[PDB]
Design a binder for these strands. Sequence first.
RNA 1: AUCAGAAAGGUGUUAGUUCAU
RNA 2: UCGUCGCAAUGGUAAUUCAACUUAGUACGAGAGGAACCGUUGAUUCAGAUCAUUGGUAUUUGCGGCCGCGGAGCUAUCAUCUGCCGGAUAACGGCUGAACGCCUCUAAGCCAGAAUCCGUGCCAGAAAGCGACGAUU
RNA 3: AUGUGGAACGGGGUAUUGAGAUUAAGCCUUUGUUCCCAAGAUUUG
Lengths: 56, 315, 222, 126, 83, 151, 102
Amino acid sequence: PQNEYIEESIRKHGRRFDHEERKRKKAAREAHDASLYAQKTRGIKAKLYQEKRRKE
Amino acid sequence: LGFLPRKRASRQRGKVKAFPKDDASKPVHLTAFLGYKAGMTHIVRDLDRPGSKMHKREILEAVTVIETPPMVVVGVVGYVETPRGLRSLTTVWAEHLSEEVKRRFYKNWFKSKKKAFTKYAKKYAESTQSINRELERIKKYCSVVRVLAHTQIRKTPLAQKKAHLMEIQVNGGSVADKVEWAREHFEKTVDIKSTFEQNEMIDVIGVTRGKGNAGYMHRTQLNSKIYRIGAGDDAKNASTDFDATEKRITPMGGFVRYGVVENDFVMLNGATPGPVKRVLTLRKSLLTHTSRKALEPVSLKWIDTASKFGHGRFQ
Amino acid sequence: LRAQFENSNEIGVFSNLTNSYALVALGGSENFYSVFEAELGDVVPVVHTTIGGTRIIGRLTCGNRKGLLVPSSTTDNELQHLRNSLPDPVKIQRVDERLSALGNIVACNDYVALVHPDIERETEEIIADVLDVEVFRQTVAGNVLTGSYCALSNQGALVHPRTSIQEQDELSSLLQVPLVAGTINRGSDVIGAGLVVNDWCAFAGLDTTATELAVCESIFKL
Amino acid sequence: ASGTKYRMTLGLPVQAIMNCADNSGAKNLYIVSVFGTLPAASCGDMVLATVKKGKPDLRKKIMPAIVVRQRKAWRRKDGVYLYFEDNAGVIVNPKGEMKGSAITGPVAKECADLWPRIASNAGTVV
Amino acid sequence: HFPININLTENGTVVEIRNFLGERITRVIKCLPGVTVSIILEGNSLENVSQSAANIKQICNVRNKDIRKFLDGIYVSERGNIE
Amino acid sequence: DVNTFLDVVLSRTQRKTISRIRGFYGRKVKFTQDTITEKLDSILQEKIALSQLSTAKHLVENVARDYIRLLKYGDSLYRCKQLKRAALGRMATIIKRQKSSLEFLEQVRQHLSRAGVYNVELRDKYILQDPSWKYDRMPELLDGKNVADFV
Amino acid sequence: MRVHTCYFCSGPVYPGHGIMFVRNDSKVFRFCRSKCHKNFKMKRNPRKVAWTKAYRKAHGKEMRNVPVRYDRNVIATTLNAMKRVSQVHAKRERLFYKKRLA
RNA sequence: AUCAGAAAGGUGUUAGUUCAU
RNA sequence: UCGUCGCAAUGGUAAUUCAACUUAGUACGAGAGGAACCGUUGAUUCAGAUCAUUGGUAUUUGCGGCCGCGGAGCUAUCAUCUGCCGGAUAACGGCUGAACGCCUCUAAGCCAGAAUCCGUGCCAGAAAGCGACGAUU
RNA sequence: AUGUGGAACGGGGUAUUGAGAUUAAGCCUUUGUUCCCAAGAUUUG
């Protein structure tokens, strides 16, 4: 619609029931995903991923 | 590469490399049939297909007519499955053997002494204990049952005097139930009318006709639905109930390379491999499709009996 | 009454709405027929009779409430079946109209089933007799086939906007009912094809021009 | 246009003079650049056609031509390829509606079904 | 906007979901053995209930739809002991 | 993002991967500059300081393109790589120009954010005295005859 | 279904066979065979062809659009009328067979 | 080792060391 | 020995590339434009066929007057046409569940999910595979 | 390899061409006719 339609709809109706739970689950799995992705990284993307991890 | 290499068919009569899966719950029934393709004719049938562009409209399409006389069960074959494959444990033939089957069994019908299976027929008449023991073993040990039957070559107007005998696997019921059904149907004629209701899609297997110095290759067309399975005795086999007009399915002046068909015949839409007067095998499809075309009933409106030979003008 | 013919808006072409029995066709848009059913279809029986084996019965047969004028190509027995299939007041007879789309040719108006200007007098007379409503030669929207180019009904024979005021009046006098010039079927010259005008209620196309839909109702006083 | 696509004869083929049956001031309409271009347009399929005869503005400028009839043999309801009187292509607008006032000559039923305006134009449908 | 119709068959062993965001294709999910669904699902196997809930959530999933905008779907509210 | 676009350009060069190799290295750098220019054009499709930053990015891209031309002239693999690194160094300056541009681009983005089987027939609904006979297959084509025509 | 009459050969026309032609004056012409179509395309006079039935009739060598209620009996009655006409046609054919010999 | 075997990273282990509580 | 009918180790491999309408002319969307899935309409490509339908070709080289054509048969994106199956899972996202009393696509497990793969179907058949079976100089 | 035996013709039917002729040759069929033959050798336990 106009302005923040998504924000207005969320305030009027409500957010997802499991939005917080999914975010918490994703955040917990982030530590496992980062190590797994680095281990499974291959090719030029592996060098880029390693460089990004080293820089961070 | 699917058809490569292109080689001539090793068998004049089409052999089905596979059969539909048998169900114990379903009743014992046949799954294949043999017929001789008489020719192809143009017929008009109403297309009662919902959602089609020409729904409730009559369409002129090619119909392939193959004579399907009743087949007499010569005997039964008991194949026992093994880890190395399907092993034929034994085969039992009826006491009475047809002359055409005996003629087919020998390369020299006139020169033969007709001694084929003479001892077996004599032994069966002398003592049926071995046959019962063999039948019991098949019903108790064999896992695959195939019924051997010979086509009515003499009834059909074919120069060949040898019946196109073939073995068809039995699908339905238990091994004992199949054995009992085979024993009941032993030395008995089985018509295609009981096997096929002419309201389903089946597969036709046949050898293509060569075209001189490309052809003579076995093919198995699928998604073929029988349009009309008529009986030669009935005069209304080729005539629909829409306008009566009883007539023979044969074209005026005789069918092209076939002559006149007098036994039971089945007409299905579409073309099939092989020329006229060629043996073809019709069997139920192994895989069942619930398509509208395969489920909608087929009702012929007009059947053209015009002279296929030459340029016919009168039906 | 706006009624889109599925993807298109040619409700009148598919079904010649007729206060006695709307001349619907086999394969015609269900939504267009159902919306026509809601408007006057209870009074105007929408029998899905494919006139001449065509999904556009309204284009093929001049389905007036006094009767439906099927084309000359349509079989007499098929018309006899179609006339029997439709209500007795709306008789679907095989008018000897040279146009295979006789209903497109002949303005399917219940009061007078105004025939196409290109349609011959014998074709017009046959269209008049088959539809039991007078068939005068009329060219709606500059198109000889007024039946598709004019939303014809006893209440109103609304012409397409392409038709002049005199041309709409000419189609009006030919169909013996008012003819408001409204271009049905998405603004096209096909008023009658887009809009299924019936005496009980002049249906139209949902995807068609809103002004034409109003013109069809205004001509039919609906 | 409308109608079910099929392997049927096309009245308005590309580089073919589909006569502009619709009364747009054009007698004929040759498809220099047929719309949706064996590029061809069936009976009622609006192919952009430059007027071969009649209107000069439509001439040498591809304008949609909803084929009134297909001169080539077109499969009928029975599937029998039936050849109409002519390959006349009634002039249609860019939206597919018949640009011409009234289609003349033989207008096949496919032309009427493809475009309701062509059906309106088809004063003598054949 | 379009309510989702849920149908239970075979004492809740089969669940049919219709009109899910307007979808005209009904999704059929077979419940795990020992679990009955009436949506509250009760059973003697916690893993079977969890797997069935995941399958129901997977069935009622929006594809190529905005998660933030379109909040329609099926989510587990709570899970505990029957007794 | 601008860095993602540069990474995408680098990824395209990686996907693609003496004098001929030197030209390929220059072409890859030029293609990366072309992709950066395409990204700048897309940003323009999606002004003032932003245009100046885009012009600054284009100027740095031209420097990278000049280094790309130097890469082609650098037939030696090390020479081609050295000039390619100079293009990357020029691309770094483009990223510095993009840094201000992306902030303006991010603000612009924030401002923008703020069934087929149906058959019918009137014969079923026939009002005939013999509607059942109407639905029934009356004599129509006796082996293709005119039985229906007679009716 | 309707069995049309050939324009040249004056014979019955069945679906799938024959050729149908449409003229500018909304005239429909049917050819029984390719030779009849070729004769029609050659502007051959039907009365000038010995094999044509039109010449046989016009040489001394030979002798309902109203709709109704849809009844299968009406179609059967019409078919019976066609059978009666066929018997009369057979009598006419008998005259045609003898007169053509003369 | 899910490429065994005969620069580095690892929600990779193996043994662990040191420091914190 | 002559065979007759079957089995399948093994390989090739098949259907293929895209669509639209219906669906719904609606979920989304202020509305308009336009939802997954359903069937239909197809466009293909390839393969399988056949000459019924369609055109020609055509040694009925047959006919009627070298021409005017040609039956049969052949041929076809010149014709009429017919035309695959579920899994394993990839990418991908999971659920539950340790390490990390929880959590945690995962280390246990349970999964979902690809024109891919494997199966499956078709084709051929180990010339140096097999079975049943007849007669038996 | 002695009988619907087959193979040949005689044909008919059949279409062609435009009623006639060729008329199955990869159009059909034959209560028609006769010919040949209860084969000629070979292979093989």
